[PDB]
Design a protein around this motif. Structure first.
Motif, short mmCIF file in Angstrom:
data_model
loop_
_atom_site.label_atom_id
_atom_site.label_comp_id
_atom_site.label_asym_id
_atom_site.label_seq_id
_atom_site.Cartn_x
_atom_site.Cartn_y
_atom_site.Cartn_z
N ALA A 1 38.94 26.62 10.38
CA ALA A 1 39.56 27.63 9.95
C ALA A 1 40.12 28.68 11.10
CB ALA A 1 38.89 28.54 8.65
N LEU A 2 39.07 28.99 11.92
CA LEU A 2 39.33 29.66 13.11
C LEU A 2 40.26 29.10 13.90
CD1 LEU A 2 35.73 30.39 13.95
CD2 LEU A 2 37.10 32.23 13.46
N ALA B 1 42.83 32.44 5.40
CA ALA B 1 41.77 31.79 6.19
C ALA B 1 40.36 31.84 5.62
CB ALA B 1 41.77 32.29 7.40
N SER B 2 40.15 32.74 4.84
CA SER B 2 38.70 33.09 4.60
C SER B 2 37.94 32.68 3.38
CB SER B 2 38.37 34.78 4.88
OG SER B 2 39.05 35.56 5.84
N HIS B 3 38.04 31.38 3.26
CA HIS B 3 37.38 30.66 2.10
C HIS B 3 37.06 29.19 2.69
CE1 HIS B 3 38.97 33.51 -0.73
NE2 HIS B 3 39.95 33.74 0.13
N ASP B 4 36.30 28.35 1.92
CA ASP B 4 36.19 26.85 2.06
C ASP B 4 37.57 26.30 2.15
OD1 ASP B 4 33.01 26.24 0.69
OD2 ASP B 4 33.69 27.69 2.06
N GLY B 5 37.82 25.47 3.39
CA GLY B 5 39.19 24.77 3.26
C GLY B 5 40.18 25.72 3.75
N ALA C 1 48.74 34.75 -2.91
CA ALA C 1 47.87 34.83 -3.88
C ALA C 1 47.28 33.54 -4.24
CB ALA C 1 48.39 35.44 -5.02
N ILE C 2 47.95 32.62 -4.36
CA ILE C 2 47.37 30.98 -4.66
C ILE C 2 46.68 30.65 -3.74
CG2 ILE C 2 48.24 28.65 -5.07
CD1 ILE C 2 50.78 29.90 -6.60
N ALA C 3 47.19 30.97 -2.38
CA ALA C 3 46.27 30.09 -1.14
C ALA C 3 44.91 30.84 -1.09
CB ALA C 3 47.28 30.29 0.06
N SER C 4 44.87 32.04 -1.58
CA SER C 4 43.63 32.74 -1.12
C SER C 4 42.33 32.46 -1.87
CB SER C 4 43.96 34.35 -0.99
OG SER C 4 44.91 34.53 0.17
N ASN C 5 42.07 31.12 -2.13
CA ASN C 5 40.84 30.87 -3.00
C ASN C 5 40.48 29.55 -2.34
OD1 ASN C 5 42.84 32.03 -5.27
ND2 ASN C 5 40.74 32.90 -5.15
N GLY C 6 39.07 29.30 -2.49
CA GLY C 6 38.94 27.58 -2.47
C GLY C 6 39.97 26.88 -3.08
N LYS D 1 41.55 26.11 6.50
CA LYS D 1 42.51 25.29 7.48
C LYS D 1 43.66 24.92 6.61
CE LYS D 1 42.85 21.06 9.81
NZ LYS D 1 41.97 19.82 10.43
N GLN D 2 43.29 24.04 5.54
CA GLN D 2 44.14 23.21 4.56
C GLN D 2 44.91 24.53 3.67
OE1 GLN D 2 44.13 20.07 4.60
NE2 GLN D 2 42.29 20.32 6.15
N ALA D 3 44.49 25.45 3.58
CA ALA D 3 45.35 26.46 2.66
C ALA D 3 46.48 27.29 3.62
CB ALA D 3 44.33 27.41 2.21
N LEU D 4 45.72 27.37 4.83
CA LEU D 4 46.88 27.74 5.80
C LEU D 4 48.10 27.06 6.27
CD1 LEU D 4 44.61 29.44 8.43
CD2 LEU D 4 46.26 30.69 7.29
N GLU D 5 47.61 25.50 6.44
CA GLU D 5 48.73 24.51 6.90
C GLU D 5 49.55 24.45 5.52
OE1 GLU D 5 46.56 20.99 8.06
OE2 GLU D 5 46.07 21.91 10.00
N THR D 6 48.99 24.14 4.56
CA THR D 6 49.96 24.06 3.33
C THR D 6 50.88 25.24 2.78
OG1 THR D 6 47.89 22.96 2.43
CG2 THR D 6 49.67 23.30 0.74
N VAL D 7 50.23 26.38 3.36
CA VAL D 7 51.06 27.82 3.19
C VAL D 7 52.32 27.43 3.76
CG1 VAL D 7 51.67 30.11 3.87
CG2 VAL D 7 49.67 29.21 2.40
N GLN D 8 52.12 26.92 5.18
CA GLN D 8 53.10 26.77 6.33
C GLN D 8 54.19 25.85 5.88
OE1 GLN D 8 52.38 24.81 10.16
NE2 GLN D 8 53.90 25.85 11.18
N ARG D 9 53.53 24.80 5.23
CA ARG D 9 54.24 23.63 4.71
C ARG D 9 55.22 23.65 3.41
NH1 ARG D 9 53.14 19.00 0.92
NH2 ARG D 9 51.01 19.48 1.52
N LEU D 10 54.57 24.79 2.56
CA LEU D 10 55.23 25.05 1.38
C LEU D 10 55.98 26.17 0.88
CD1 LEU D 10 52.80 22.77 -0.96
CD2 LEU D 10 55.12 21.96 0.12
#
Length: 489
Positions: free
Chosen positions: A380-381, A406-410, A438-443, A412-421
């Motif tokens: 995440a960092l 960024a501040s949940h398990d995964g 909003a969708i991205a900000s959870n595990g 990195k994935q959530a950030l990258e997927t935000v970038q992609r989608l």
DNA sequence: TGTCCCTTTATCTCT
DNA sequence: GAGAGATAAAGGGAC
């Protein structure tokens, strides 16, 4: 001709650094260390075919496939079998890479190819379940064993196909399966465990030794040590396995009597992968962390009680002064960062990047700590450091929103997927960015977003019933699992 | 000399 | 937060 052979090898590595793979030093080292010289040479010989039609593998996928014992055979096999596995069996390339990317990948590939039809058509498994069974060292052994044993395990023993899949989907899955078959009756009938508890024990690596060790030590840990069958079960099924159980047998008295730990916190320490290492490390370091670092015993126990707790503890001992006095972090913050799986990586990453993130990206120490205090904190960092500026410039996000994703398990994935989608979500689906955030900000923010884009594109009438806005709200606190829950009613 | 399988440990991600 | 699934790496034994 050792020097000429060496020259040849180094020329090979150097050439791999070029097209089509453009491998970095880390990648070369990975293949060298895990797959050996033959794997390096294999990758080099087949680079064009692995990256070209009909495979189209990314360099990362090629690296993942090569980086194992037999890596060469796996790469060879993926070249033969991927088009059939994808076009005939309906697997995605990434699923193929996952089957391939283990020691003996060639065997697991030949075996998914041969067995996937019977497993799905006759036994009722999904292709995804078959992929999960196959995606470990010995995958062939597990696949053949599920094929042989699923009927006896389900009918004669009462287990669900899902439970069998859970047992089978670890390294040594075959061993685990046969040992459940042997030991399920005793453990339920004689020890009063539920089948689910036995599945929970069996479905870790070394499932077999964990089962055998629960049989062996459940009576003596309860009788002679005062533990409840529940505690013993938690210890056995939390990844600690045989090692953890035996170490609790050895160290419980000392840790309670001499170090003053309750049996409950000893159980908390035992109850993860590497629990043995964690137990031994608490025994070693509890004095030092609690006299010359002012850490409470509760805090030490809290750090110790995650997978690889050992690493987290030693790392806390090493880095606590530097992080407190140089980086201005409070000990409580250091504990919070330490107290997750991979706390060591999170701590080391905070030590490395805190100044950078605070000064080049303007983040407060509290935000950096927020990001770091989840499993995968390091990842995440690093991806905040990478993607903070682009997400603010291109997609118009605030630093706050980036930290929140960024501040949940995964994270990195959530950030990258935000970038992609983010583009297609907002452009083609008149979706709002605060919504996607909003969708991205959870595990599970990643698979949430992906199930969203899947719905919008190749929608599903059944699900095609909520508003581009109703599905948003659904994903917003049930994620992918909520979307599937509705899309089956 | 590599290939295949299994256990233990560490790390990351999702439910 | 806890449980669970998944990816990575190490180290060992068997051929």
């Amino acid at each position: 001709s050792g020097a000429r052979a060496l020259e040849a090898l180094l020329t090979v590595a150097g050439e791999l650094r070029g097209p089509p793979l453009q491998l970095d030093t880390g990648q070369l080292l990975k293949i060298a260390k895990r797959g050996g010289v033959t794997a390096v040479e294999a990758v080099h010989a087949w680079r064009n075919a692995l990256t070209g039609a009909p495979l189209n593998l990314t360099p990362e996928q090629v690296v993942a496939i090569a980086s194992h014992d037999g890596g060469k055979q796996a790469l060879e096999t993926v070249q033969r079998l991927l088009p059939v596995l994808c076009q005939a069996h309906g697997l995605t390339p990434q699923q193929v890479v996952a089957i391939a990317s283990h020691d003996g990948g060639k065997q697991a590939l030949e075996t998914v190819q041969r067995l996937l039809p019977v497993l799905c058509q006759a036994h009722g498994l999904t292709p995804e379940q078959v992929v999960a069974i196959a995606s470990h060292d010995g995958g062939k052994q597990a696949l053949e064993t599920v094929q042989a044993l699923l009927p006896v395990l389900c009918q004669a023993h009462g287990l669900t196909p899902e439970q069998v899949v859970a047992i089978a989907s670890n390294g040594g899955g075959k061993q685990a399966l046969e040992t459940v078959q042997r030991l399920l009756p005793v453990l339920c009938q004689a020890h009063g465990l539920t089948p689910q508890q036995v599945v929970a024990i069996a479905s870790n690596g070394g499932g077999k030794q964990a089962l055998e060790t629960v049989q062996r030590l459940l009576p003596v840990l309860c009788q002679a040590h005062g533990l409840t069958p529940q505690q013993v079960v938690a210890i056995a099924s939390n990844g600690g396995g045989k090692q953890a159980l035996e170490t609790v047998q050895r160290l419980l008295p000392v840790l309670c009597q001499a170090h003053g730990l309750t049996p409950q916190q000893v159980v908390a320490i035992a109850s993860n992968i590497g629990g043995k290492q964690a137990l031994e490390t608490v025994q070693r370091l509890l004095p030092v962390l609690c006299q010359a670092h002012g850490l409470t015993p509760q805090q030490v126990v809290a750090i110790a009680s995650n997978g690889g707790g050992k690493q987290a503890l030693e790392t806390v001992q090493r880095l606590l002064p530097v992080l407190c006095q140089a980086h201005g972090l409070t000990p409580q913050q250091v504990v919070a960062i330490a107290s997750h799986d991979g706390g060591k990586q999170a701590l080391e990453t905070v030590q490395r990047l805190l100044p950078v993130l605070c000064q080049a990206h303007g983040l407060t120490p509290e935000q950096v700590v927020a990001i770091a205090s989840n499993g995968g904190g390091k990842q995440a960092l690093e991806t905040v450091q990478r993607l903070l500026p682009v997400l603010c410039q291109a997609h118009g996000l605030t630093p706050e929103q980036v930290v929140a994703i960024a501040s949940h398990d995964g994270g990195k994935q959530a950030l990258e997927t935000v970038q992609r989608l983010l583009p297609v979500l907002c452009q083609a689906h008149g979706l709002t960015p605060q919504q996607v955030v909003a969708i991205a900000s959870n595990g599970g923010g990643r698979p949430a977003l992906e199930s969203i884009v899947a719905q919008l594109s190749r929608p599903d009438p059944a699900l095609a019933a909520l508003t581009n806005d109703h599905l948003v709200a659904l994903a917003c606190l049930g994620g992918r699992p909520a979307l599937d829950a509705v899309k089956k009613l």
